[PDB]
Every structure is written in C-alpha cells, then in structure tokens.
Motif scaffolding. Sequence first.
Motif, short mmCIF file in Angstrom:
data_model
loop_
_atom_site.label_atom_id
_atom_site.label_comp_id
_atom_site.label_asym_id
_atom_site.label_seq_id
_atom_site.Cartn_x
_atom_site.Cartn_y
_atom_site.Cartn_z
N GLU A 1 0.82 -1.21 0.00
CA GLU A 1 0.00 0.00 0.00
C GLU A 1 0.86 1.26 0.00
O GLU A 1 0.54 2.24 -0.69
N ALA A 2 1.94 1.24 0.77
CA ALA A 2 2.83 2.38 0.87
C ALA A 2 3.45 2.78 -0.46
O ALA A 2 3.84 3.94 -0.65
N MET A 3 3.56 1.84 -1.39
CA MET A 3 4.14 2.15 -2.68
C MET A 3 3.17 2.07 -3.85
O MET A 3 3.57 1.78 -4.98
N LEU A 4 1.90 2.32 -3.58
CA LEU A 4 0.87 2.31 -4.63
C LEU A 4 0.87 3.67 -5.32
O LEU A 4 0.13 4.58 -4.93
N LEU A 5 1.70 3.81 -6.34
CA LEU A 5 1.81 5.05 -7.08
C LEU A 5 1.71 4.77 -8.58
O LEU A 5 1.75 3.61 -9.00
N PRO A 6 1.57 5.82 -9.40
CA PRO A 6 1.47 5.64 -10.85
C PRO A 6 2.60 4.76 -11.40
O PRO A 6 2.35 3.80 -12.12
N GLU A 7 3.84 5.10 -11.05
CA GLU A 7 5.01 4.35 -11.52
C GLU A 7 4.92 2.84 -11.30
O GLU A 7 5.23 2.05 -12.20
N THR A 8 4.52 2.43 -10.10
CA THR A 8 4.41 1.01 -9.78
C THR A 8 3.41 0.31 -10.71
O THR A 8 3.63 -0.82 -11.13
N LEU A 9 2.33 1.00 -11.05
CA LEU A 9 1.33 0.41 -11.92
C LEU A 9 1.90 0.19 -13.33
O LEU A 9 1.72 -0.87 -13.92
N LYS A 10 2.58 1.21 -13.84
CA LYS A 10 3.19 1.17 -15.16
C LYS A 10 4.22 0.04 -15.23
O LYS A 10 4.33 -0.67 -16.23
N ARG A 11 4.95 -0.14 -14.14
CA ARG A 11 5.97 -1.18 -14.03
C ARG A 11 5.39 -2.60 -13.99
O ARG A 11 5.94 -3.50 -14.62
N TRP A 12 4.31 -2.80 -13.24
CA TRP A 12 3.69 -4.12 -13.16
C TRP A 12 3.12 -4.54 -14.52
O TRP A 12 3.30 -5.67 -14.95
N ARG A 13 2.42 -3.62 -15.19
CA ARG A 13 1.82 -3.93 -16.49
C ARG A 13 2.87 -4.18 -17.56
O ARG A 13 2.62 -4.93 -18.51
N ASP A 14 4.04 -3.57 -17.41
CA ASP A 14 5.12 -3.76 -18.38
C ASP A 14 5.90 -5.05 -18.15
O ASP A 14 6.52 -5.57 -19.07
N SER A 15 5.86 -5.58 -16.93
CA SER A 15 6.59 -6.79 -16.61
C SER A 15 5.82 -8.10 -16.74
O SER A 15 6.38 -9.16 -16.47
N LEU A 16 4.56 -8.04 -17.16
CA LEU A 16 3.75 -9.26 -17.27
C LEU A 16 4.21 -10.23 -18.36
O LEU A 16 4.46 -9.83 -19.49
N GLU A 17 4.31 -11.50 -18.00
CA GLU A 17 4.72 -12.54 -18.94
C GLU A 17 3.83 -13.78 -18.82
O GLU A 17 3.46 -14.18 -17.71
N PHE A 18 3.49 -14.38 -19.96
CA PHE A 18 2.67 -15.58 -19.96
C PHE A 18 3.37 -16.69 -19.22
O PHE A 18 4.58 -16.88 -19.35
N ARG A 19 2.61 -17.42 -18.42
CA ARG A 19 3.15 -18.53 -17.65
C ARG A 19 2.03 -19.53 -17.44
O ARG A 19 0.85 -19.17 -17.48
N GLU A 20 2.39 -20.79 -17.26
CA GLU A 20 1.40 -21.83 -17.05
C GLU A 20 1.19 -22.11 -15.57
O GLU A 20 2.15 -22.19 -14.81
N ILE A 21 -0.08 -22.22 -15.19
CA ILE A 21 -0.48 -22.47 -13.81
C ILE A 21 -1.30 -23.76 -13.77
O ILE A 21 -2.10 -24.02 -14.67
N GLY A 22 -1.09 -24.57 -12.74
CA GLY A 22 -1.84 -25.81 -12.63
C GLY A 22 -3.24 -25.51 -12.11
O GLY A 22 -4.24 -25.98 -12.67
N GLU A 23 -3.30 -24.70 -11.06
CA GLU A 23 -4.57 -24.33 -10.44
C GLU A 23 -4.58 -22.89 -9.95
O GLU A 23 -3.59 -22.40 -9.40
N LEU A 24 -5.71 -22.22 -10.16
CA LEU A 24 -5.89 -20.85 -9.71
C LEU A 24 -7.18 -20.79 -8.90
O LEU A 24 -8.24 -21.19 -9.38
N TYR A 25 -7.08 -20.32 -7.66
CA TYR A 25 -8.25 -20.22 -6.80
C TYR A 25 -8.56 -18.77 -6.49
O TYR A 25 -7.72 -18.05 -5.96
N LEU A 26 -9.77 -18.35 -6.84
CA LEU A 26 -10.23 -16.98 -6.62
C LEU A 26 -11.58 -17.02 -5.92
O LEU A 26 -12.50 -17.71 -6.36
N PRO A 27 -11.73 -16.28 -4.81
CA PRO A 27 -13.02 -16.29 -4.11
C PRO A 27 -14.12 -15.51 -4.84
O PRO A 27 -13.86 -14.49 -5.48
N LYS A 28 -15.34 -16.02 -4.75
CA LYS A 28 -16.51 -15.39 -5.34
C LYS A 28 -17.06 -14.48 -4.24
O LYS A 28 -17.37 -14.95 -3.15
N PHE A 29 -17.17 -13.18 -4.50
CA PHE A 29 -17.67 -12.28 -3.46
C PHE A 29 -18.45 -11.09 -4.00
O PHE A 29 -18.66 -10.95 -5.20
#
Length: 365
Positions: free
Chosen positions: A236-264
């Motif tokens: 939370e302390a580093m939630l700034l514009p730059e961090t967002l730009k950096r995360w979106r630029d570093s995304l790479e396709f990868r294979e996952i066996g299982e992904l669990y996301l809660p329904k809310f």
Amino acid sequence: LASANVDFAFSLYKQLVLKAPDKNVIFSPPSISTALAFLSLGAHNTTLTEILKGLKFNLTETSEAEIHQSFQHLLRTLNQSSDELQLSMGNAMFVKEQLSLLDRFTEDAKRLYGSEAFATDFQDSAAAKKLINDYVKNGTRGKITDLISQTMMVLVNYIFFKAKWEMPFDPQDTHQSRFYLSKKKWVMVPMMSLHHLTIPYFRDEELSCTVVELKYTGNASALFILPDQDKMEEVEAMLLPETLKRWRDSLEFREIGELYLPKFSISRDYNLNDILLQLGIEEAFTSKADLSGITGARNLAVSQVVHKAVLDVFEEGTEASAATALSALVETRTIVRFNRPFLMIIVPTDTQNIFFMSKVTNPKQ
C-alpha cells in the motif's frame, strides 16, 4: 491527461485507508473526477483553482477549457453498452422549483457533460431523497445550499458496468474453503477455480507480491495483486502511478496448474468531506465559496459530497450490481491461491486509466 486521473485515484485510496485501516474498500475514480469537474463549471477564482489542482491537473500546462474538453471526450468513449462489454455514465441536476440560472451555465453543462435538469420539490424531503437515491445506484452526489441553509440543488454522476470473463469459471469447480483474515483466523468462502491455463504473470520481489491479469471479452482487464502474509501495508505504501506502469510492463505468460479466486460481493457508502479537505479542496465548503457562475450571485456553498459503489465477482464475470443465484477436487503441480487479503484493479487494455479500485480484507463482510 489520463495521468491526472490515475494520479488522483491513488491519492484518494491512501486517504480512505487511513480513515479505515482494516475494512474493505471499493470506489469508482472516474465518477468522482467527473462530478467535481462538473461542479467546477460554475466556479471562479480560488474556489476554481483548488478544485482543478485537487484533481491533479498541471495548470502551468493546461487551460481550464482543455480540461472540460477532456471530460467531454471521456464521456463519449465510455458509453458503449453492446460489444459484450457494457459501460455507461451520465450526469444530471435536481433543482428546486423556480430557481434562476445563467444561460451559459445551463448551456455548457449540456454541451460538455450531457446534463439533464429536473424540477424538484425539496420541501417534501423524505420523498425527494428517495427519488435521488433510486436514480443513482453507483455514483457521486454533491449537495449545494445557501451560503452560510436549505438545499438549492444536487449534482449527480452515475455509472454501470457489466463484463464477461474471457476464460469463464465453471460453477461445478467452486468449493467451500478457508480464507485467513489473520495468521490464525479464517472464515468459509465459495472458492472458484480454473485448471491448466496460461495467463500474464509477474513476481515482484521488491514489494513481495504476486500479480496476475484476467481479461474480459472486450477492451478491458482485471489485475489481482497478492501480497505475502503481513505485507499489505508495505505494498500500500508504494501504490503510485510508476508502480502500476511497471507491473503492467513486466507481465509474462506462464502456465499455472490451479488458480483459486473467491466469489464475493462488496458495497460501500462514503461521505467525502474530510478527505477532500485533506487534498486541498477547502474554500467551497466555506462562506468564502465562489459559485457565482451558477445563478450569478455568490450565495451558494457546497455542504456534502457522497460516493456509493457495488461490485460483484462470480463465475461468468463482473458486474456493478447485487447478486442472485460432480466437482471432484484435484491437487498437483503449481497452485496460486487468493486465500488472504488482496487488491483488484479494473483497467482498460489500451490506456493507462482505472475504472474501479478495491481491496478485499474480509469477503464475508
């Protein structure tokens, strides 16, 4: 530009969290931004300057006129409820019967913000309040009164959103499971899941969190941030514009066996007076308020600003509204599990802006 809207979004978030450190958060930045700029239309001098700067625009680089053109443009793009991706936004004003307004105010509101006007009888408050609440399910309201009161008018902005997951979950793979609130406390939650998939991924060792992107059909995506245990406050302390730009630029396709996301589903009702004061928007709440651009006289002042938002996440997709509704378990290879507090940001694919921001500390709240 849009760098102002994203900047404004993280600044708002920081203040909301300081108000409440352990509760869920949910809000729509573009609704709050447009409403304030809708208001600034009948403002002058210091009152005007504090609003535009509070919104994070650089006045040394942009004129007021250009700012209203941007919001006019922002409204024409959003409205697109058809291509499987539904998104809509509108503005309006409720005015007390027999209240004179300047021709330019009425005209500009119409040409730039597509505003509608409704003759309203506030003397019958109980009913006048219900009509407005029913008109705005998701949105922002600005109550205006007589300088130093009663109620002269209410400005409003509303929004709707409905989208479909590009890779739908199957209702048959949803199971009751654990969700740790603390390192020793938990609750039961409907956990959805997908198996054997390839999606954009990135591990941020600097901030100690995991980022994943799930697309919707259409031009939009949802980003999910999973901080390690006891690391939310550090992310939370580093939630700034730059961090967002950096995360979106570093995304790479990868294979996952299982992904669990809660329904809310989560909803919140905010009174924004204190917050706006903390951002530099002060004079409009005082006697020194200059809203002479509405009726011609300096007899008006803002008394209350409220925001309301609802988010629903399920098997088929995401909707800004309430809910209504074998399965053999597998366990092997890799397993990404959102069973602890996380963040969710909904952004358009080709643009650097945000439609919804939320933090989920307790899904059963």
